[PDB]
Amino acid sequence: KVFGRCELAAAMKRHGLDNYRGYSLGNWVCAAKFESNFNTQATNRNTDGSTDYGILQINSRWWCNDGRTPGSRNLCNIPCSALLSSDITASVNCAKKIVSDGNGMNAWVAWRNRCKGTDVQAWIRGCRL
Ligand SMILES: [Cl-]
Ligand SMILES: [Cl-]
Ligand SMILES: [Cl-]
Ligand SMILES: [Cl-]
Ligand SMILES: [Cl-]
Ligand SMILES: [Cl-]
Ligand SMILES: [Cl-]
Ligand SMILES: [Cl-]
Ligand SMILES: [Cl-]
Ligand SMILES: [Cl-]
Ligand code: NA
């Protein structure tokens, strides 16, 4: 599913991401924009052999099982394919664990490089939320 911007903001908000670990909703929308272009089916191989999955590009080295990432863990206790669903529940539950791991949203390199410190409120402008 390719979410619209406000459509994703509303779903993330409903799932409790707004101000989760202190990160406002626009941070999460910005991260999803640059991680997946709001496409739940996005997948991208990393150089280490892991793969990132779904709207928030959650990686298989630590967070989900894809059966092809040697030495990796599955700390969200889910198959990585569950992160590609139209329904973002699994991705959000897993993202909550990631952003709690110690470095906050810096875990998403694209957030650090493209969203951190910017006017992230713009990502929720116009939305009836
Ligand atoms: Cl915001
Ligand atoms: Cl881009
Ligand atoms: Cl894909
Ligand atoms: Cl992989
Ligand atoms: Cl995801
Ligand atoms: Cl594996
Ligand atoms: Cl393969
Ligand atoms: Cl393994
Ligand atoms: Cl999803
Ligand atoms: Cl933080
Ligand atoms: Na894994």
UniProtKB/Swiss-Prot annotation:
Ranges for domain C-type lysozyme come to: 1-129
| InterPro entries in the cross-refs | Glyco_hydro_22 (IPR001916), Glyco_hydro_22_CS (IPR019799), Glyco_hydro_22_lys (IPR000974), Lysozyme-like_dom_sf (IPR023346)
What SUPFAM superfamilies does the annotation carry?
Lysozyme-like
Q: Which reaction does it catalyse?
A: Hydrolysis of (1->4)-beta-linkages between N-acetylmuramic acid and N-acetyl-D-glucosamine residues in a peptidoglycan and between N-acetyl-D-glucosamine residues in chitodextrins
Q: Which GO terms describe its molecular function?
A: beta-N-acetylglucosaminidase activity; identical protein binding; lysozyme activity
**Record's keyword annotation contains Hydrolase:** yes
Q: What does this protein do?
A: Lysozymes have primarily a bacteriolytic function; those in tissues and body fluids are associated with the monocyte-macrophage system and enhance the activity of immunoagents. Has bacteriolytic activity against M.luteus.
Name of the protein: Lysozyme C
Q: Which gene encodes it?
A: LYZ
